[PDB]
Every structure is written in structure tokens, then in C-alpha cells.
């Protein structure tokens, strides 16, 4: 019947799916922290929510691929891909 009951907030999500989602992120964080680099936490960069069902689920699509990035972050991404 193609019924997926997994549509739920992350607080009540399963531990297995949460670990599956978190494992690549944790691995990436460990890889970038092993080398050792400065971390920027500027307050002017708080752009988490700037772009324009059950339990108030209202998804949206964000197209942020047009933002140009620095060469240092490009090299870091290349190293992560390698």
C-alpha cells in the first residue's frame, strides 16, 4: 500500500534511523577535527531560516546552490571527498 509511518519529528524518531542519519555527519566532523583547524562562529552568519499534514508538517524546498564559496572550503570539501 506504500504507507510510511516514519513521518514524525526528530525528537520521537527511532534510534536506529537517527544513528544512520548521524553516522556520516559524525564521521565528517571527526575527519575535520583530526587535522585541526580554526572554527568560525560569527553571529552575522545565522542563516538557518532565511529562505522563503500531521503535527504541522510543512516541508519546503531550498535552492542555495547559487551561493559562491571560498577556495579554502572548496579544498576542504575536496579533501573530504578524497
Amino acid at each position: 500500500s506504500k504507507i510510511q509511518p516514519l513521518m514524525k519529528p526528530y525528537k520521537l524518531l527511532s534510534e536506529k534511523e537517527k544513528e544512520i542519519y548521524r553516522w556520516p555527519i559524525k564521521e565528517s566532523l571527526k575527519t575535520m577535527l583530526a587535522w585541526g583547524w580554526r572554527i568560525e562562529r560569527t553571529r552575522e552568519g545565522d542563516s538557518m531560516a532565511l529562505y522563503n499534514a500531521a503535527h504541522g508538517y510543512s516541508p519546503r524546498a531550498i535552492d542555495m546552490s547559487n551561493v559562491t564559496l571560498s577556495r579554502d572550503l572548496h579544498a576542504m570539501a575536496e579533501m573530504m571527498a578524497e
Binding site: 583547524w37 562562529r41 560569527t42 552568519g45 545565522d46 542563516s47
Partner: peptide
């Protein structure tokens, strides 16, 4: 993933 929240890795 890295652009959000202003997280920039620098040497």
C-alpha cells in the same frame, strides 16, 4: 551543509 549557520573552516 557547511554554508548554513556561518561555519567556515580556516587554517
Amino acid at each position: 551543509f557547511l554554508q548554513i549557520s556561518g561555519y567556515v573552516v580556516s587554517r
